[PDB]
Design a protein around this nucleic acid. Structure first.
Lengths: 77, 149
RNA sequence: GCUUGACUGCGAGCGUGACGGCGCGAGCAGGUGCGAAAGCAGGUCAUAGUGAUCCGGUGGUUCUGAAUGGAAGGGCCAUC
RNA sequence: UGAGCCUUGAUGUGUAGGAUAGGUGGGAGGCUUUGAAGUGUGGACGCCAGUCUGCAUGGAGCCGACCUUGAAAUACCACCCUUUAAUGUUUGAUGUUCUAACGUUGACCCGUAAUCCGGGUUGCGGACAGUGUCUGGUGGGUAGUUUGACUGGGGCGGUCU
RNA sequence: GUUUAUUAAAAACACAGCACUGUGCAAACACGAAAGUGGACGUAUACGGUGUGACGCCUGCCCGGUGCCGGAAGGUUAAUUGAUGGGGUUAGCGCAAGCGAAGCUCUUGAUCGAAGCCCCGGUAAACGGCGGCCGGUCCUAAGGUAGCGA
RNA sequence: UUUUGUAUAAUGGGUCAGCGACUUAUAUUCUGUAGCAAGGUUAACCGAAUAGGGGAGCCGAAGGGAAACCGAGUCUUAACUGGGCGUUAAGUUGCAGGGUAUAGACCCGAAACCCGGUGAUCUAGCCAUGGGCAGGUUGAAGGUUGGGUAACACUAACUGGAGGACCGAACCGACUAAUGUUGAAAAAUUAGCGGAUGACUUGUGGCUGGGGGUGAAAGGCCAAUCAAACCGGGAGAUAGCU
RNA sequence: AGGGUGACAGCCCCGUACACAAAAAUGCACAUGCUGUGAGCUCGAUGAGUAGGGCGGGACACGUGGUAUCCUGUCUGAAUA
RNA sequence: UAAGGUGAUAUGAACCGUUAUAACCGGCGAUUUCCGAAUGGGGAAACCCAGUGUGUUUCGACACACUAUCAUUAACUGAAUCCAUAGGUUAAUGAGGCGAACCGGGGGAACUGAAACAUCUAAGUACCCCGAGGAAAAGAAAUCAACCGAGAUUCCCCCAG
C-alpha cells in the first residue's frame, strides 16, 4: 500500500471543490519513492518505500535512528 | 545540506570544511563513498578528535580517486604498461593496472576498473579506455598508451 | 428680468391598497429666491417614464469595537 | 550567456590653470632595486585634451605650500556618493559531457530441479523518463440536473410590468 | 450464414473484398486506484479502430466551416515569484491639530512564466458541400461530372 | 364517493365474522379550572424516595432607541407647538382542552434513487475435453491413355473425390395456416416449411456480474423478470394526487 | 405474597414471615505472605523536520468571509526560559 | 435429600430400592465419535489419502503419539560473495475463529427538504471495514477568564433556540 515507512503517510480523502462549490470526493496521495539507502552500520543497501518528507527526516535524524524506530515499530525492511 | 569533507573534493573544499552541498549530491555520491559526512553538531565534535588519524594516516594512504570518476581522467595514472593487445582496440581485456607501475605505489594510489565483458563486442570497430567505466560505448575513447603501446 | 423651494427636519388630517406600499396635504422650525406688498415657491397642466430583499462598493458618523488602547469588522445617515 | 554582493583595480572636464578640482578629517613628501622616470604599443574610454592599463628592454627619478584658485593636490591613510571593469561567489538560461539517484517487460550467478519476486555482476538508457502536490487547456467518456405560465384541449402564434 | 427465447427472419446484422487511419514493441488499444493481464509467446505481408460491403465499369469537383495533422514572427494566457505604492499598530517629537523610524501586519500587484486559443499550410474512401443571370457577367470553397430517374 | 349537477349507463363493495385510520413526545400561544399573588415556580441532584431539601435558573413587576445611553419616558431633530413607540391593563405554576412547530405526524399507495450481497444449473460469448450427422446425387484440382505446339496453349475417355455444393431422415431450427387462448401446454399440437460436413450441432466442466457482462447489433440475452436483474437495507423515501 | 386442591381456603397442600445449614469449589473484605516494580531531599535537564509559513482540502455551531484556533496531502521551516 | 424410581410422547416388559451407593439435587473429576478457526495433505462439510516415532504380532496386520500457517526469541546452519547477509532446519511461547448491544478508528451514499435545483440539507446518518474492553474514549492546561479569579477528563440540568 502507498504508505511511507518512515512517517506513515497514507492516502487521505478530501474534496475537489469547483468554482460552484461542487464537492466531489478525491484522494491526496503522498510522494512515495522506493530508495536504496547506504547503511554504514552493516555496509549494505537497505531498500525502503519513503516519501520525500521521510527522506528529509532521514537526512536530519540519520538512517540508523530511523531504522531503529522502524524495527521498534516492526516494519520488516 | 551542510557536510564536512573527509577528503578532497574537486570544487567544494579540501580536508575539512562545512560546505553547503546539494542534498542529492551528498546523499547519492559523497556519503556512499568516503568523501564527506553530514555535520549534525555531534559529528563535528567527534571530527575534532578524529582529525589526528584522518588528516595524517588516511590522508597519506588515500587522498585521491575518492570515487574513481573524475580523478582518473584528470590525474593521469597507470600510463606506463607493457601489454599491447590485438590491433589497438581494447575489448574485454583487463590488462594490467597494478603491476609495472611506479607512481601508483606511494601514499595516495588511484585505481581503475574493468571493461565491458564479451557478449556482442570484439577486436574491431570501436575501442575501450583503461579506466573506471560505467558507460562502455558513449564513454570517452581517448588512447591510454595501452591499446597499442 | 432676477433666481435655485428640483431646499433640510417634521407633519394635523385624509384617500387608495390583503399586504409590501402608493398618493394628497394645510401647518411648525431652520435657511433661502422673487415681489413695494399682500404673498408665491418642498420641481414641471394632471395622470405612464419602473424593480422588494440579500451580497457588496463609495462619503460621513469615534454608535459598537470579544483582556485593555487602537484598528478590522458591524450599525446609523447619504448614495451606487 | 544576466543580475545583487566582502573587497579592491577604473569614474568624477561651470572655469580659474602648469590641465580632467565629488568631499570631511591626517598630514607635510608618497612610490622606485618582489624596480622609477624615458619609447613603440594591446584592446578598453574619451568632451578630440589624456586618464588608467600588459609587456619589451629599461636602471637612478615623474609627482605640494606651488603665484593664483569660492575647491589645493592621486603625497601617503578611511567611510563614503555619481559611474564602470572581474572573479571565489548566489541562484536564471542554452548547450554539450558525465554517473552516483532513478528505469530496464537486456545478459549471466545465486535463494532454487521456479519465464514470479528478490539480491548480485554487467550492459544500455540517465537526472531524461516516470510518480506525488499545485496549475492552464481539453474533456456527453461519466454524473447530477434545468428547459415557465396563461391558453374555449395541447402545440405553433400572441401575451406577461 | 445471424437476428427481436414468447406478435417482426427481412431490404436489417454478419460476410469474403476494398479504402482510410493509428500502432517500432514495455506497440497502439482494452480490463484494472495498482501489481499485472489480453493484444501475442504475435512484430508493419502484424495488430487495433472506423467506413463501405462479391464481382464488372467506376468513384468527378470543393479544404471556405467543424475535425484531425504540421509549422510557426507575433498577441493573450495559470500555478509559482513578489518591484512599487497605500493602510493599521508604536519609539519618539510634539505647550498641540498632528507627524511619525524599526519590527510585525492587511492590501495592491511591476517582472518571469507552457500548452491552449488568435494566425499560416495540408487533409474529403474525415464530418460535410456542390449557383444564378442575359442571348459575356455577379457571387462562391466549388458550383452535381459519369451513371440513373414518378 | 366525487361533483354545478348522479336512479344514474361515473367510483366502491359477493355476504358474514374478526381487525382497520387524527396518535405520542417536547416546545409554544390561547380558553376553562385550581393554588399563590408583585410575585409565581423549580430542573438536574440529595433524599428510608409521590414527603422534605435544592431558587442554579425561567417568566413578571419598564419602556424607548440600531446602539452607547436615558428612563415614566425615550427616539426622531439644531429644536419640536409636533410625530412614533410606551406610562393609566397581574402575573406565574400545575391539570383539561383547542391551534401551531419538530419529529412518519390521520391511514394505505408509487414510478424511481442509493448502499451491501445472491445469481451464467436459462440464456449470450468464450475456454478445455468427449460425441453426432441414414441414404442418394453432382463430379473441382490432380493423375494416366489420347487428339495437339519446335517446347507452353489445348481437346475426349478413364481415374480421382473438392465444395460454408445439391435432394433428403436423425439432429438443429421456426416461414404459412388451422386449433387452442379459465389451453393437454405461463409459447404448444397437426399439416406443410429452412439447414442438414459446417460460420454445424451436442454432452461434461470452467470463465465473464448489474452502469457491469455478453451481444454476426434486435436494446437482444444475463434462472418464465431487463432502456439497467434478484435479495436485503436507507425506508414508514417523497406523493401540492386518488 | 403467590400457586394448587372437584366452586371463591390465613388454619388441606406447597409455600410465605422468621430462625438455621456446606464435605467441596469459588467471589468479596480485612489481616497476611513469595518474587518482582521502586519512595524522599538535592542538583540538573525539561520532547526540531517540531512550532510557524506558501498551496489544496477537512474538523470546529462558523459554508473563506474582515476570520482567530485546530488536522494534514505537497513544498518549506525557527526560538529553544 | 430420600420411600420411592429407570426423561416425555407412552402404555407394557425386565428390573432397582424401602434407614442407606434406588432415584433426584449441588461441587469437583473422568469419557467426550466425526465435521467445523480444523491445524498431517486434499476435498463436492461431517469424507478421501498419508508420513515419522515408539509398543505389540499368529507374520495376517494392529494400537498410541506426533506431523498446519504466521509472529517473536534463541540455537545450529548458510548462497551469489572473502568476511557477511538473505535464506534453511529445529525448539519454546503467542495468535487465528464465534458472539446481540455499547466503544474507538479507516471509508462513506442517495432518497429527502429547499414546495424546481447546483452551494446547503438529509448526514458523517445508512452501510462496508479494522481493533479493544467490561466498559471504551478522554484525562491532569503551551485551558479558560478578565486585571477579579478558576483550576485534569467524563456525565446530567440551565445558559439558549
Amino acid at each position: 500500500s502507498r504508505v511511507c515507512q518512515v512517517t506513515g503517510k497514507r492516502p487521505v480523502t478530501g474534496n475537489n471543490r469547483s468554482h460552484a462549490l461542487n464537492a466531489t470526493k478525491r484522494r491526496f496521495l503522498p510522494n512515495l519513492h522506493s530508495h536504496r539507502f547506504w547503511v554504514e552500520s552493516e555496509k549494505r543497501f537497505v531498500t525502503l518505500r519513503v516519501s520525500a518528507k521521510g527522506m528529509r527526516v532521514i537526512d536530519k535524524k540519520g538512517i540508523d535512528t530511523v531504522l531503529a524506530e522502524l524495527r521498534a515499530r516492526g516494519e520488516k525492511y | 545540506m551542510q557536510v564536512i569533507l573527509l577528503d578532497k573534493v574537486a570544487n567544494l573544499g579540501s580536508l575539512g570544511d562545512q560546505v553547503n552541498v546539494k542534498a542529492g549530491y551528498a546523499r547519492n555520491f559523497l556519503v556512499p563513498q568516503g568523501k564527506a559526512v553530514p555535520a549534525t553538531k555531534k559529528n563535528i565534535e567527534f571530527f575534532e578528535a578524529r582529525r589526528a588519524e584522518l588528516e595524517a594516516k588516511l590522508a597519506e594512504v588515500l587522498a585521491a580517486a575518492n570515487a574513481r570518476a573524475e580523478k582518473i581522467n584528470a590525474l593521469e595514472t597507470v600510463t606506463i604498461a607493457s601489454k599491447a593487445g590485438d590491433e589497438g582496440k581494447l575489448f574485454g581485456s583487463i590488462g594490467t593496472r597494478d603491476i609495472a607501475d611506479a607512481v601508483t605505489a606511494a601514499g595516495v594510489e588511484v585505481a581503475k576498473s574493468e571493461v565491458r565483458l564479451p557478449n556482442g563486442v570484439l577486436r574491431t570497430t570501436g575501442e575501450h579506455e583503461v579506466s573506471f567505466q560505467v558507460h562502455s560505448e558513449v564513454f570517452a575513447k581517448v588512447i591510454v598508451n595501452v591499446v597499442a603501446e
